[PDB]
Amino acid sequence: GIVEQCCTSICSLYQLENYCN
Amino acid sequence: FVNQHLCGSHLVEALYLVCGERGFFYTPK
């Protein structure tokens, strides 16, 4: 998932912002 | 914190900054 991907690879900002409420 | 590896607490710090007063959910699963 996200916790994995953004650590092992590089996430774009919009991938992060998908987890805002 | 754009264009970098965000591991452990650093991902949470990034989410806090991005999401602001919306808050966010964090699910390592």
Method: X-ray
The answer, for B5 touching chain A at a CB cutoff of 8 Å, is yes
Q: Is A3 exposed, middle or buried (0-12, 13-18, 19+ CB in 10 A)?
A: middle
Spatial neighbors of A10 by CB under 8 A, at least 6 apart, are B3, B4, B5
Measuring CA to CA, how many Å separate B7 from each of A4, A7, B21? 8, 5, 22
Where b means 16+ CB within 10 Å and e means fewer, B1-29 reads eeeeebeeeebeebbeebbeeeebeeeee
CB B27 within 8 A of CB A21: no
User: What resolution in Å is listed for this PDB structure?
Assistant: 2.0
How many residues does the structure list for chain B?
29
Q: Check: CB of residue B6 under 8 Å from CB of residue A7.
A: yes
Question: Which residues of A fall below an 8 Å CB-CB distance to B?
Answer: 1-4, 6-11, 13, 16-17, 19-21
A9: CB partners within 8 A, 6+ apart? B5
The position carrying tokens 């991938």 is A15
